[PDB]
Design a protein around this nucleic acid. Structure first.
Ligand SMILES: [Mn+2]
Ligand SMILES: [Mn+2]
Ligand SMILES: [Pt+2]
Ligand SMILES: [Pt+2]
Ligand SMILES: [Pt+2]
Ligand SMILES: [Pt+2]
Ligand SMILES: [Pt+2]
Ligand SMILES: [Pt+2]
Ligand SMILES: [Pt+2]
Ligand SMILES: [Pt+2]
Ligand SMILES: [Pt+2]
Ligand SMILES: [Pt+2]
Ligand SMILES: [Pt+2]
Ligand SMILES: [Pt+2]
Ligand SMILES: [Pt+2]
Ligand SMILES: [Pt+2]
Ligand SMILES: [Pt+2]
Ligand SMILES: [Pt+2]
Ligand SMILES: [Pt+2]
Ligand SMILES: [Pt+2]
Ligand SMILES: [Pt+2]
Ligand SMILES: [Pt+2]
Ligand SMILES: [Pt+2]
Ligand SMILES: [Pt+2]
Ligand SMILES: [Pt+2]
Ligand SMILES: [Pt+2]
Ligand SMILES: [Pt+2]
Ligand SMILES: [Pt+2]
Ligand SMILES: [Pt+2]
Ligand SMILES: [Pt+2]
Ligand SMILES: [Pt+2]
Ligand SMILES: [Pt+2]
Ligand SMILES: [Pt+2]
Ligand SMILES: [Pt+2]
Ligand SMILES: [Pt+2]
Ligand SMILES: [Pt+2]
Ligand SMILES: [Pt+2]
Ligand SMILES: [Pt+2]
Ligand SMILES: [Pt+2]
Ligand SMILES: [Pt+2]
Ligand SMILES: [Pt+2]
Ligand SMILES: [Pt+2]
Ligand SMILES: [Pt+2]
Ligand SMILES: [Pt+2]
Lengths: 97, 99, 103, 78, 98, 83, 105, 94
DNA sequence: ATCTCCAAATATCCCTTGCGGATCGTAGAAAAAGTGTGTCAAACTGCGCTATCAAAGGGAAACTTCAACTGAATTCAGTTGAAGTTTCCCTTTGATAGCGCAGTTTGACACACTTTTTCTACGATCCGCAAGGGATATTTGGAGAT
DNA sequence: ATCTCCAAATATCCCTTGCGGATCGTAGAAAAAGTGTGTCAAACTGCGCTATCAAAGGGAAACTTCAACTGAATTCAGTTGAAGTTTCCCTTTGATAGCGCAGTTTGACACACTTTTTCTACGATCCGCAAGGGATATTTGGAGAT
């Protein structure tokens, strides 16, 4: 038995728009924060909640960006999000020149 | 004792009172409590911030209930602004009654 | 307490102290904390009112962050007020664009 | 480290976002975008840390930093 | 009689209006609009002439910027022609509502 | 005397000139009424705040500074009229 | 050396900056170096814009600086442009710029 | 009544930088907006910093990190250095 | 390929104003100088919590397999908006005069502040118990095949 | 439009843990009281905003003609998604080692405050004059046409 392309996708959309769980695995993301902080100031520690803060903020940001990117895709009679969609989303937001 | 573990200060217990007032059989998780505590601080600053500017703009040295009111009118959207101006005017009417 | 004289749950005395410590202005009138406390109380009343209902609709007796998010995003005017805010652990409103659904 | 943000993870993010079909080039772009984002916030978070003469980045330092970028977050000491 | 191809005058107009800085909305019309709107909020308001000029500077700036973004949306959709859905898209993404 | 329908003072040529400054080459016929809507909502928002500043000062004349402060509030800071 | 500007080596007025920090309810007390540091920063940024606007007036065969020169200055400079990303310079116009696809082919 | 302005200091700085160049009155008005604008952003963030750190006073340190937070990259470096250099020179006197 | 022609760019003269450079005289504000006072820098200290570690299983990420369906290219015709023409409305300009009201001025005081003792609300810390979590079964809402 | 067939939804029971009430104890709010100064009410005023008019003319509205753009239709290589197998690392759990955050104490010094002396900067005003900016004519780069 096969589900048509797009059907498990739509199922996934419904699932995740219902949950509140973080969708990035905690440890890879934590390594990323420390790598980045390290480039600004060396010998730094983090309260556990601060990484948490950064992951809530990071994910809310990205989720909100895919909403915007998705609309741009649809604006172009497409259904697939592409880099040019993120780029336009970010430009119209004034995040990017 | 002797070395005291400081003292955090929140609106958690006033938020709990108001929640009772409106949903007596409903309760609230500590995470959601924390969110309401942020909201109150966030709004307090947004308001006190405008009031402060209004007082500067008009060359006055005091934040009166007049500045709070117009701060509120600038800060809050349509219907929320109208209700908030009631509850505020009413509290002051009532507070100055009581002596 | 000034809170009782004003008919409020929210602490008129604290709000008054907090106004004097925040360097907002040289002086704080006597009416100003009352009106502020009153407004803080009204708005926290207004969120919990809708958030509670969202706990009902979702069959719960405890308000969690996701009910605050549904309260907020489903209400036009609070959505505006919190336009630039993210509620940790709130997730998003269920929304799927028309053209993505099968015919 | 930026590859720790894996393809399936980006897909989950995109799905909460309401995205049905994702082009293969999207996964690199998002990694670029997240890096720029995290950099800006951490730059400011660390600025606040240094100023307090501390060695530990706090939740408040982050909340302050997200407030500066106009991205107020509730639930961590707002 | 001579006749320019469609788009030729449009291009030359873009150059002209991008070189210069004068207000592009007429002055009396704009002021009538402000007074009308002010009135629905409060009767008996008067305006410093420079208050209206500030408003007009801000409004022409806002719209000129919005048309920049609207164009990016038309071009994104492989069109050269701006349309209502382009502005709606620009405004949605900018986070403007109502 | 009654003020009515003034958004039609924002004419078709005027909207076209603004599009030109914005680099717009071709404009569909429906744009002009969309643009009036937008401008109206823009002005209602700024003026609302300008007028609140005015009412607060117990004034009847709206000043450049009320407009300048209103724009700052909306995050659309303006240089050239005070502040 | 009398004035605090002269002392600090500055054109911007340390005395005025001190007073405005005090009468602006930023904090109870204002340190001695604060208005100095701040007048220095205000002077640097104005010198960087006037420099860049100056060039723009000269490129446009002009002797006197007008708002269009400030506008050209700010928006052709990645960093000033960002600092004033949310600002409108009255009477500055926009940068000349036409997307490619619209050029005659 | 007196209307305070930065116009004289802006002329002075303009003469240093472009000695044969003038400034129109509107252009001056913008420059005066720019200075009040930036002053506000800096004193504002400096104010938060002192509150965040339970401190009663605004010192050049807060101005400095406010500068680092507000100005973009290369502009923060030069302003930081023009600013510390003026304070050093100022202490070296009295 | 070469000519024709139109609007923007350049050239001419004239003249209005807004500027920059004086000189002025004059209110307010900076500095100089003295003194009262609270903020905060240092130094020493407890312990909360970040870092780290070691292991072990479980499930997630990676990689592979296939073909469904999507995006991108091509072609075309009817639609529609640009260019240019004509008619005359209404905006702009310049001055006018009446006066509504913004903003300055001045005395009287209610009202906020600041200091000190008394009353007490709200923070910290505690944990029994039920709301919710998680595990398993049974139902229901659809998708995809024929 | 009718039967087979998943995955999500709902039902149900047993376990886990964080709600939310209760105990206790202090930091801060309240009461009471002497103190001055920012605010307010009320008198007076002339900048400048509203209103009007009249004339000139720049520009808007309405119209015709048609070039070219939009978008409907068609085709299809190929990029994705669904699902299977394989490989890898994340999460949990149980502490132990100790960094460094934040509590406490304090006096030296730096900043506030307030009075007198000193001079900077703003408001009001003229002036050489190149900078413009406008009204009028001509030349020019290149779109479109022959
Ligand atoms: Mn109720
Ligand atoms: Mn009306
Ligand atoms: Pt905090
Ligand atoms: Pt002003
Ligand atoms: Pt002048
Ligand atoms: Pt001048
Ligand atoms: Pt004097
Ligand atoms: Pt001294
Ligand atoms: Pt002392
Ligand atoms: Pt295993
Ligand atoms: Pt497994
Ligand atoms: Pt397609
Ligand atoms: Pt055709
Ligand atoms: Pt048409
Ligand atoms: Pt036309
Ligand atoms: Pt008169
Ligand atoms: Pt008045
Ligand atoms: Pt007095
Ligand atoms: Pt249960
Ligand atoms: Pt349950
Ligand atoms: Pt459950
Ligand atoms: Pt069924
Ligand atoms: Pt069924
Ligand atoms: Pt079916
Ligand atoms: Pt707990
Ligand atoms: Pt005590
Ligand atoms: Pt106490
Ligand atoms: Pt007084
Ligand atoms: Pt007095
Ligand atoms: Pt005429
Ligand atoms: Pt005419
Ligand atoms: Pt004409
Ligand atoms: Pt095919
Ligand atoms: Pt194929
Ligand atoms: Pt592929
Ligand atoms: Pt230990
Ligand atoms: Pt240590
Ligand atoms: Pt320390
Ligand atoms: Pt002490
Ligand atoms: Pt000239
Ligand atoms: Pt000229
Ligand atoms: Pt000219
Ligand atoms: Pt030619
Ligand atoms: Pt040609």
């Amino acid at each position: 038995h096969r589900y048509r392309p797009g059907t498990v996708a739509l199922r996934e959309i419904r699932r995740y728009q219902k949950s509140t769980e973080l969708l990035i695995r905690k440890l890879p993301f934590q390594r990323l924060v420390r790598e980045i902080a390290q480039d600004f100031k060396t010998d730094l520690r983090f309260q556990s909640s601060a990484v948490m803060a950064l992951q809530e903020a990071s994910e809310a940001y990205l989720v909100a960006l895919f909403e915007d990117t998705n609309l741009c895709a649809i604006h172009a009679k497409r259904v697939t999000i592409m880099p040019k969609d993120i780029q336009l989303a970010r430009r119209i937001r004034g995040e990017r020149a | 004792k002797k070395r005291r573990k400081t003292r955090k200060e929140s609106y958690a217990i006033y938020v709990y009172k108001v929640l009772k007032q409106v949903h007596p059989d409903t309760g609230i998780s500590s995470k959601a409590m924390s969110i309401m505590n942020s909201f109150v601080n966030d709004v307090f600053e947004r308001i006190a911030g405008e009031a402060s500017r209004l007082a500067h703009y008009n060359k006055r040295s005091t934040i009166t209930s007049r500045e709070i009111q117009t701060a509120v009118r600038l800060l809050l959207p349509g219907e929320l602004a109208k209700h908030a101006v009631s509850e505020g005017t009413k509290a002051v009417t009532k507070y100055t009654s009581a002596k | 307490t000034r809170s009782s004289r004003a008919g409020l749950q929210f602490p008129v005395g604290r709000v008054h102290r907090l106004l004097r410590k925040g360097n907002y202005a040289e002086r704080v009138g006597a009416g100003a904390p009352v009106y502020l406390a009153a407004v803080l109380e009204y708005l926290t009343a207004e969120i919990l009112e809708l958030a509670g209902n969202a706990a009902r609709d979702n069959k719960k007796t405890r308000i969690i962050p996701r009910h605050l998010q549904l309260a907020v995003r489903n209400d036009e005017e609070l959505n505006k007020l919190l336009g630039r805010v993210t509620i940790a652990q709130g997730g998003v409103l269920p929304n799927i664009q028309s053209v993505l659904l099968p015919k | 480290n930026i590859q720790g943000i894996t393809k399936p993870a980006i897909r989950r993010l995109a799905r909460r976002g309401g995205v049905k079909r994702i082009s293969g080039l999207i996964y690199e772009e998002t990694r670029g975008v997240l890096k720029v984002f995290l950099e800006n916030v951490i730059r400011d978070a660390v600025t606040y840390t240094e100023h307090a003469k501390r060695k530990t980045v706090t939740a408040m330092d982050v909340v302050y930093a997200l407030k500066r970028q106009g991205r107020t977050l509730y639930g961590f000491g707002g």
